[PDB]
Amino acid sequence: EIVKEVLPLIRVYKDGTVERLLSSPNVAASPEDPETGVSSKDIVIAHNPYVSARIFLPNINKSHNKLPIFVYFHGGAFCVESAFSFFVHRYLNILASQANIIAVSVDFRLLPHHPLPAAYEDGWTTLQWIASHANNTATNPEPWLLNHADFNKLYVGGETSGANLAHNLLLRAGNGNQSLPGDLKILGGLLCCPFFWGSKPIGSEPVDEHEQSLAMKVWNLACPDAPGGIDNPWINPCVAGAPSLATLGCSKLLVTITGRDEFRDRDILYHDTVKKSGWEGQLELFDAGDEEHAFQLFKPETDTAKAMIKRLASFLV
Ligand SMILES: O=[N+]([O-])c1ccc(O)cc1
């Protein structure tokens, strides 16, 4: 008995069993990935609500300086994909080695059982957990963080909905009422093809088909009780009455887009809005080329993919 369905992403049955789109199976963490030299392990950030993660530590050939931390949130429209998939594992191995940074891939809660803002909270739980290492308030600290992490170089980011998640975290961080343990600051944000939408079609978005877009079905699954619906500031950050993008709680921000991504114009609008908002930080835009969103995870061997990774490495510093 089917209660909910957003094809091709997800089907939900009466008894809470779910069929999910699966683009790659999960793989085991590695003591040393053969191609990149990156070590990875799987850890528990919080038991309840349960939030786990894979942390990636690149080859330590020198240890004069500690390494930037990159908290990554996978794509998958809040309802599919995983922190531990073949694609994410292989991508972060490359990123961690090419950029020489520690990566933390967060397995945040998903629809159907955990509607937004669950995922957002899990992201915030992750950042608190990280900051608790910096001021020695962590209870079961991850030794890799204590030994190798530069806590003043915390970067937060992701793909599509994961990037929407990071964006939301940046706002929380730059809100005066909210702070991290030790008042740790996020240095930078990296949003790759972030999932943003709106009730009115814009740019090259098809007008007649708009109200039937997959983006709208995804959002209705993720947050049906959202006031304003598809114009809720969580999904439409450029909407009237949304918090000002001048309160983004970081100092540097890179937005990446692709030519074929559905959210290209939304992303472009987001960037321009950040620019003409008075946000004082360093703002950057990167057009990765004639590709789909997340293309670099699927085909990291292409010239286009390699150029994107090099770009990211120059940002994650
Ligand atoms: O990957 N994602 O997070 C997505 C993918 C497709 C979509 O329509 C919305 C979000």
Author numbering: 9 to 325
Publication passage describing the model:
Isoflavonoids play important roles in plant defense and also exhibit a range of mammalian health-promoting activities. Their biosynthesis is initiated by two enzymes with unusual catalytic activities; 2-hydroxyisoflavanone synthase (2-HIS), a membrane-bound cytochrome P450 catalyzing a coupled aryl-ring migration and hydroxylation, and 2-hydroxyisoflavanone dehydratase (2-HID), a member of a large carboxylesterase family that paradoxically catalyzes dehydration of 2-hydroxyisoflavanones to isoflavone. Here we report the crystal structures of 2-HIS from Medicago truncatula and 2-HID from Pueraria lobata.
Although co-crystallization of 2-HID with various substrates and analogs was explored, only a structure of 2-HID complexed with p-nitrophenol, a product of the carboxylesterase reaction, was obtained and well-defined electron density was observed for the ligand. The ligand is located in a pocket formed by the loops β1-β2 (P16-L17) and β3-β4 (L29-S31) in the N-terminal region, helix α5 (L222-V226), loop β10-α4 (D269-F271), and helix α7 (H301-F306), including many hydrophobic residues (e.g., Leu17, Leu29, Ala85, Leu222, Ala223, Val226, Phe203, Phe271, and Phe305). In the bottom are Thr168 and Ser169 in helix α4 and a glycine-rich motif, Gly83-Gly84-Ala85, in loop β6-α1. Several charged residues are located in the pocket, including Glu89, Asp269, Glu270, and His301, which may play key functional roles. The location of this pocket is similar to that of the substrate-binding pocket identified in the structure of carboxylesterase AeCXE1 and is also similar to the gibberellin (GA) binding pocket observed in the structure of gibberellin receptor GID1. Sequence and structural comparative studies with AeCXE1 showed that 2-HID possesses two corresponding catalytic triad residues Asp269 and His301, and the catalytic Ser is replaced by Thr168. As observed in the structure of the complex of 2-HID with ligand, p-nitrophenol forms a hydrogen bond with Thr168 which is regarded as the nucleophilic residue for AeCXE1. However, in the 2-HID structure, the CG2 atom of Thr168 is close to His301 and its OG1 atom points to another side and forms a hydrogen bond with p-nitrophenol. In addition, Ser169 in 2-HID is also close to p-nitrophenol and could interact with substrate, whereas the corresponding residue in AeCXE1 is Ala170. The 2-HID mutants D269A, H301A and T168A had no or weak carboxylesterase activity on the p-nitrophenyl valerate, and the activity of mutant S169A was reduced to 52 % of that of wild-type enzyme.
